Structure 1
């Protein structure tokens, strides 16, 4: 396991998301499903020129997996995934410019729900999660686990878990008062409200 320090802009945004009083927390799911949809668009587009991009899996889908025993809500996709370079470096650049633009917009009257317009909607996961584990597999790299409970640092390690083939799993270790997001009725309500027209099958798993 390797440990990395977040740059100051991202660190401040993670603190804002964790600490600000904001009741409309459900938007996190729309954001993560929308990120999953974009990653699926990317692998599908690549496959149009190179069909072998799908040798790691032809199915293009989004799975919503709650687990009451573990208190986790996992968003799984068979999208493009992320390489180690994406996880440590490329996404750190996106997170910096995106945070600066979002922090700017917030001072200019914008709402926390507009986070996705700034390329950092992934961070809305901290509205409901005390820890986020991202398991990912990109065609050009190995399976990795990125993780952060904020506090200024994140970890990256080669993942020994079940081989995914290709894609990303966003594991939300829910805060104790956010367990409503493990309830079938609640997840169904949110998906219907914000994600009804996503162009991939979304399966809401049950227990």
Structure 2
């Protein structure tokens, strides 16, 4: 069964702003997603000190960037802590509201969309390049879930597909005019410019 949820008003507004605003510096979405992967990897590295059994679902702590020109998708995979069904919906809850509002006000005060991550809502920058985002996640304490949204004020959640052990996979179904983010040289340049100091291996898969 598929569950359909409405985004909180501020999020639906933020997502419309991101989609409708003229903003050429779209490449910032990647830094935001990598930064989110990095935080999940730190959380699993930290929980594994006190409880080593939390790494039974996978020892390797890494980020994989997977472009697929046939499906027109860019996949960002990590082996971080992952998210429970509760983490999924709770992170699309009241926490994001304060950040969204502060970001919304900053933009009116002259800040630009590249500052989105400082407000903890960097994920939504994925809608600068993606017409639809699918998020597959697996936490040690729960089952595998698939979150999906093409914006429009709603998102869906369902029990997920091939098992992934532990972590989060972000599948960006790119807009027709955003296929440059499938090119090896373009992804390399962006990772080098914005994510050069990430404390985890970043493997750019080739096709």
- Name the TM tier (shorter chain): over 0.9
In the alignment, the residues of structure 2 paired with residue 44 and residue 138 of structure 1 have an alpha-carbon distance, to the nearest angstrom, of 14
Q: Which runs of 5+ in 2 are unaligned?
A: none
Counterpart secondary structure, 1:36: helix
Displacement, 1:91? 3.4
Displacement, 1:89? 2.5
Q: Identify which range, 176-185 or 80-89, moves more after superposition.
A: 80-89
Match of 1:39 in 2: 40
Equivalent runs, 1:93-132 vs 2, <5 Å: 93-132=94-133
Moved over 3 A (4+): none
Alpha carbons 2:47, 2:54 under 8 Å: kept: yes
TM-score (structure 1 length as normaliser): 0.98
Alpha carbons 2:34, 2:195 under 8 Å: kept: yes
Deviations 1:120-162 (A, max 9, x none): 1000000000000000001111000000000010000000x11
In the alignment, the residues of structure 2 paired with residue 111 and residue 165 of structure 1 have an alpha-carbon distance, to the nearest angstrom, of 37
Deviations 1:68-127 (A, max 9, x none): 000000000000111101111243222222211110111121110000000010000000
In the alignment, the residues of structure 2 paired with residue 15 and residue 92 of structure 1 have an alpha-carbon distance, to the nearest angstrom, of 17
Alpha carbons 1:32, 1:121 under 8 Å: kept: yes
In the alignment, the residues of structure 2 paired with residue 162 and residue 94 of structure 1 have an alpha-carbon distance, to the nearest angstrom, of 31
Aligned residues: 206
Deviations 1:156-200 (A, max 9, x none): 0000x1101000000000000000000000000000111111000
Alpha carbons 1:136, 1:168 under 8 Å: kept: yes
Please tell me the root mean square deviation across aligned C-alpha atoms, in Å. 0.7
Alpha carbons 2:6, 2:155 under 8 Å: kept: yes
In the alignment, the residues of structure 1 paired with residue 80 and residue 93 of structure 2 have an alpha-carbon distance, to the nearest angstrom, of 20
TM-score (structure 2 length as normaliser): 0.98
Alpha carbons 1:132, 1:170 under 8 Å: kept: yes
In the alignment, the residues of structure 2 paired with residue 125 and residue 90 of structure 1 have an alpha-carbon distance, to the nearest angstrom, of 16
Counterpart secondary structure, 1:165: coil
Q: Which runs of 5+ in 1 are unaligned?
A: none
